[PDB]
Write a protein that binds this ligand. Structure first.
Ligand SMILES: [Cl-]
Lengths: 6, 148
């Protein structure tokens, strides 16, 4: 459930 | 339908995450923020205060919340050709409010983060500089202190 900004 | 108390509860639940980061929960908050721009002022003051008040290792996730909502609202302003930076209930005003505190929020989050989260904040500064989300001069002041 990571967050990687795109 | 998700109401504002649900938004509060979701944000409150970040305390329970070891990392303070949840892609799916950030997406829920962002979808709510895009659907309720008419109350962006209390959405924005909450996520600002979440960043101010959350634990040190959760500072990074607080900036991801601001990144997600901030760039969703930034995309609206460019779709809609709107620059009503002082009109409450608008994306442009929400971004302006975030920009007035963003240097404080960055300085505190970087100072309280370990080396790994600092590097992730550096990456956000790159994206904010490239996307045009905040005034580059504000980000310059931060980047020159912490990342040069
Ligand atoms: Cl807009």
């Amino acid at each position: 459930d990571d967050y990687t900004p795109s | 339908h998700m109401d504002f108390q649900n938004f509060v509860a979701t944000l409150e639940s970040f305390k329970d995450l070891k990392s303070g980061i949840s892609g799916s929960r950030i997406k829920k908050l962002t979808t709510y923020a895009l659907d309720h721009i008419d109350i962006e002022s209390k959405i924005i003051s909450l996520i600002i205060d979440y960043s101010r008040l959350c634990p040190d290792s959760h500072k990074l996730g607080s900036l991801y919340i601001i990144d997600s909502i901030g760039r969703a609202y930034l995309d609206e302003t460019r779709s809609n050709s709107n620059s009503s930076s002082n009109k409450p209930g608008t994306c442009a005003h929400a971004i302006n409010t975030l920009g007035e505190v963003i240097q404080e929020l960055l300085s505190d989050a970087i100072a309280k983060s370990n080396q790994d989260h600092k590097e992730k904040i550096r990456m956000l500064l790159d994206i904010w500089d490239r996307s045009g989300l905040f005034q580059k001069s504000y980000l310059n002041a931060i980047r020159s202190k912490c990342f040069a």
